Amino acid sequence: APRSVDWREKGYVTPVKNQGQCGASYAFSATGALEGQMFRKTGRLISLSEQNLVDCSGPQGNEGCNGGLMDYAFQYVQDNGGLDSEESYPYEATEESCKYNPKYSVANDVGFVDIPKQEKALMKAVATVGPISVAIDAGHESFLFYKEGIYFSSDCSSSSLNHAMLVVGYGFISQKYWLVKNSWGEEWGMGGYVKMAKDRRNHCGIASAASYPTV
Amino acid sequence: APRSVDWREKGYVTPVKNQGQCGASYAFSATGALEGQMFRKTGRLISLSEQNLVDCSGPQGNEGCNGGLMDYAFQYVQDNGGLDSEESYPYEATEESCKYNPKYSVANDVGFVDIPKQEKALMKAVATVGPISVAIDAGHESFLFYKEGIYFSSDCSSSSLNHAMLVVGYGFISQKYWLVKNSWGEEWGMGGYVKMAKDRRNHCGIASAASYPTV
Amino acid sequence: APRSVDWREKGYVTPVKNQGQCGASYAFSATGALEGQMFRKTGRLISLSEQNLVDCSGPQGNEGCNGGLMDYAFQYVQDNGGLDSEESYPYEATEESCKYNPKYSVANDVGFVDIPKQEKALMKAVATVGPISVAIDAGHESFLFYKEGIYFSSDCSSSSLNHAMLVVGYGFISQKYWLVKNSWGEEWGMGGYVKMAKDRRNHCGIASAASYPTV
């Protein structure tokens, strides 16, 4: 297996987005994972609509700007038979009424897979599938002010997860890390990304809510 | 497949326990699931120690009386090679130092299975495996005062789960429900149990965090 | 959700006390709430020491007979690891040096919850938790001479609070009221209690500073 993986280098990952003041990280994690799997299938990277998920995936269990689950987003896309492009259904950072239009659908899914709750299994998934949706404890100031290097907080919870993200790879330093895409804009962290401690007892719960869509 | 299932009738379920003021429902859900699977293997129902999990499963990610995940409890039992009986390691409803004694272990596990996030899948699991660990949104006054009949709240979340429980069966009235064991003592609800609305859009998130141990 | 609640009927509430000419209602409100939550936990109602709080909770922010906050009292008990019984540390209605003795501690707390500033939220807490610490505008002659019925003053402030009390329930007339324990002796009001107007625009600020301890 590769010692280093970075799906950004292969065209699987859209630029970093910004959820603003709307608590819809689940939507950004879901579009990120779908973007990767759609690229794997078609060879075209097309940015997908988080607003479509915020406005429309309530029946599947999501709650607009008050949270949700990536798997519920994947289920919505399955149930709905599609998901609009970011371009066609841009992000407003507030819960609005569903305005899905099937003419502008550019993605689908048939199901989704939940990865077992081990960093060994997450690593396999990242190496062999593409970018993987995850949730972590992002509540600590140390995370909020993360700038560079490998993030480790002694106070990070693995049980109380509170923020969805997208693992786009992993590597090691000249000591291992996950390469993780956030949704707080390109200015936060390392161009919008964070290297999180890997194989240090499931630090911040990185491996505990991991999944991906099948397309 | 059976239209009605109640694992209490087969000897799989210990009497209702009471977690008191300690937020360790994850531990009660986990012992309940292990109690069922140990019975399935050995033909002996033995009550298991929640305190053992509260005190000892921090390395696996649990947080004493401040929450945890059933799967982390199952992982602890696997890593540890056992779990003490309730009788040997009684419940104190506060986080204490680990006092595990291997002499008094009466349970083990080899791993655990996470069930896909569908009520169809949960029903199959309940019918074919035994009692199943779940988490729900229990944070509504209506749930706290539930007495009888099939519980349904219009305000129940499927995304924000906050209370671990144990599904011990399902059925229908003369209209379907899950039969769910709580850990708030035998006085609450129907002898400590609640019938929760089944096949009504994954009500309260009943199917969203379901799993069981393999023994 | 019950239409009438009275925690006195369930053993949660000690007899009415009398703060005398010492301005320590915060201490009586705090011991009242802790008495309730300790009973919920242990099934034993034991009167707690206001003098302990008046003499010892200065570091947490209280000011003896010149005022304080219930939350500061809860914080003191948490920091201190205990609170003496009323019997061991009797009330003297004047500030003196701290004489806490851990041998005579009969209570503890792990933290405290501040309730949102709405009568809806307060009602839920009274129904589901136990007696709740509150502060009101009690600075009107009509309140001093309250004898019976539902108290309502057209000049009552919802913002400027000046007297701490304990909500021990709520009800309605054959019209709604909060049942509130004062600390002015059993001769004042209805055996030391007042029925205060409920769901009349947060009358006298009863929902504006409500909290309870976790034990």
Next chain:
Amino acid sequence: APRSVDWREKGYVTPVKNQGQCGASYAFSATGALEGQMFRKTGRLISLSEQNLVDCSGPQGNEGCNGGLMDYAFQYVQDNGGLDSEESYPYEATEESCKYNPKYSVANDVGFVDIPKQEKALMKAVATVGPISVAIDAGHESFLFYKEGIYFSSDCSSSSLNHAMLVVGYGFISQKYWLVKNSWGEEWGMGGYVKMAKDRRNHCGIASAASYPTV
């Protein structure tokens, strides 16, 4: 985390205002906090109307020029669906009839968060959110005549608060302080600001009534 924070440097803070002889510091504190969070969302700093709050937030519990709570002000903006600009609804320093015009609304809020009563929690909120509404004991001559340096008064109360303000940052001297915006004009204190002793047992109650709006 940053050792020094000053939100004035980032555009979150309007110039110092002057409440004059109207007891509406709650309104100035609330507009300050909303000004910051609206900037955080939109990138535009627009001065908001205190007079709008003085005249119109009575139903939520405020008392015009005789006091109120910032949370009641936030609740009004939520209930009302907006708040007028300072330019459109200028400050008169007396209680008048509500003249809200929705055409001139420039702000909204979805809710508000009450911060735990600890300086640790306040610091985190200032670092990670923006300017925070607070109330302090300002009723001492030493405060009225504060000119420069770190304010510490031996007789300050942490319990009896009597003046709302806005924490816009914190720092340390070559010894820690909160940077606090007042509403007594730019000639008072340090250009209308005071450095208040930080991490000295919640001096003057600065962490006791802290909150901010979500927009």
